[PDB]
Amino acid sequence: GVIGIAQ
Amino acid sequence: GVIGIAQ
Amino acid sequence: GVIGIAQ
Amino acid sequence: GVIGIAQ
Amino acid sequence: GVIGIAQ
Amino acid sequence: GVIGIAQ
Amino acid sequence: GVIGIAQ
Amino acid sequence: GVIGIAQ
Amino acid sequence: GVIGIAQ
Amino acid sequence: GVIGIAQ
After folding, report:
1. Shortest CB distance from A3 goes to which of B3, B6, B7?
2. Which residues on adjacent β-strands are paired with residue G6?
3. Residue G7, SS3?
4. What is the side-by-side order of every strand in the sheet holding J2-6?
């Protein structure tokens, strides 16, 4: 799977 | 699956 | 599945 | 899988 | 797998 | 605010 | 804020 | 803020 | 802030 | 801040 987080 | 979070 | 969250 | 985090 | 973190 | 998701 | 996801 | 993800 | 991920 | 990842 894929987890991506932009802050 | 895919989880993506933009802040 | 897909979860996407834009803030 | 893939985890990517941008701050 | 792949973990990448940009600060 | 608060967002919570249970699958 | 708070985001929490359980799979 | 807080982001937490359980798989 | 806090980011925590359990797989 | 704090980033923690358990695999």
Report:
1. B3
2. F6, H6
3. coil
4. F2-6, G2-6, H2-6, I2-6, J2-6
| C-alpha to C-alpha distance for J7 and I5, rounded to whole angstroms | 8
Against chain G, the chains showing at least 3 CB pairs within 8 Å are B, C, F, H
Experimental method for this entry?
A: X-ray
Question: Torsion over CA of G6, C7, D6 and J7, rounded to 10 degrees?
Answer: 0
Candidates C1, D1, C5; CA nearest to H3 is: C5
* Token code pair at residue B5: 């979070």
CB contact under 8 A, A7 and B7: yes
Annotated resolution, angstroms: 1.9
Question: What are the residues of chain I with a beta carbon less than 8 Å away from any beta carbon of chain A?
Answer: 1, 3, 5
Supply C7's token pair. Answer: 């803030």
